[PDB]
Amino acid sequence: IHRTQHWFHGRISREESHRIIKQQGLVDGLFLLRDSQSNPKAFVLTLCHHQKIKNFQILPCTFFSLDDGNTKFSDLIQLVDFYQLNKGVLPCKLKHHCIR
Amino acid sequence: IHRTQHWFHGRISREESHRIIKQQGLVDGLFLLRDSQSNPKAFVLTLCHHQKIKNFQILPCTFFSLDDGNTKFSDLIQLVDFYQLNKGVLPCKLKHHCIR
């Protein structure tokens, strides 16, 4: 159900993700989620803060988490909804999605 | 937007909430949410753990939080969904809601 979300970019690569975020200005809080190219059940969150791009692996366990289970979610929509309001282990909240 | 949720008991007193939890098993993780009796813009999470009833004030910040703003939510549904999967400051996760 997350496939058509504005912040979900599908099976793009890491390199493509960094290209996109840079093209869109490296604005604080700019972010996107993508499918892992190695694990068919995992995702990656790419976000930038203070001009630095960081990647966080969202792994299953079924619930998802980007902090080794310290904080769990039932699906990606719940996860994004949460990090838009709470930093957690991230450098900043998820503010604006990178345009697909 | 939480008015019609099954875990929301509206304007019932603390005493009534405790009576309800006791009468429905007094089991770990049993919970309900209700309107605050002292703050017209606040809510209360009543939860049972180790046969002890605990009350957590959910205060507006408009966002909501029961842990002094450390964890914030856009509404009660997001809050409940989060605490059903994450303990946080609660003695345990929200497991079963009390039937109105």
Choices 3.90.470.10, 3.40.50.720, 3.30.499.10, 3.30.505.10: CATH for A1-100: 3.30.505.10
Cα dist from B24 to A52, B21, B72, B81, whole Å:
52, 5, 30, 22
Q: Domain residue spans in chain B?
A: 1-100
Give this entry's resolution in angstroms.
Answer: 1.6
Structural method: X-ray
Kindly report each contact of residues A58-63 with a partner whose C-beta sits within 8 Å and lies 24 or more positions away, as own/partner. A58/A33, A63/B85
In this structure, the dihedral spanned by the alpha carbons of residues A59, A64, A65 and A70, taken in order and rounded to 10 degrees, is -130
Contact of B77 with B2, CB cutoff 8 Å: yes
Contact of B17 with B9, CB cutoff 8 Å: yes
Residue of B61, B62, B71 best to disrupt the A interface, most CBs of A under 10 A = B71
Assigned token pair, A8: 């979900």
Answer whether A1 touches B (CB < 8 Å). no
Helix (H, G, I), strand (E, B) or coil at B69: coil
Residue of A71, A75, A79, A90 best to disrupt the B interface, most CBs of B under 10 A = A71
Look at residues A94, A54, B74 and name the one whose alpha carbon lies nearest to residue B82: B74
Which secondary-structure segment (H or E) carries B20? helix B14-23
Distance between CA B44 and CA B9 in Å, rounded? Answer: 10
Q: How far is B93 from chain A (nearest CA, A)?
A: 12
Distance between CA A47 and CA A53 in Å, rounded? Answer: 6
Distance between CA A49 and CA B73 in Å, rounded? Answer: 22
Which residues contact residue A17 at a Cβ distance below 8 angstroms, ignoring those fewer than 6 apart? A9, A32, A34, A44, A46, A55
Distance between CA B94 and CA B12 in Å, rounded? Answer: 19
Distance between CA B12 and CA B9 in Å, rounded? Answer: 7
* Residue that has been written with the tokens 């949460």 in this structure: A82
Out of A78, A85, A86, the one facing B81 most closely (by C-beta) is A78
Which residues contact residue A72 at a Cβ distance below 8 angstroms, ignoring those fewer than 6 apart? A61, A63, A64, A65, B85, B86
DSSP B73-89: BSSHHHHHHHHTT--TT
What ranges in A1-100 are assigned the alpha helix state H? Answer: 14-23, 76-83
* Residue that has been written with the tokens 């996109």 in this structure: A20
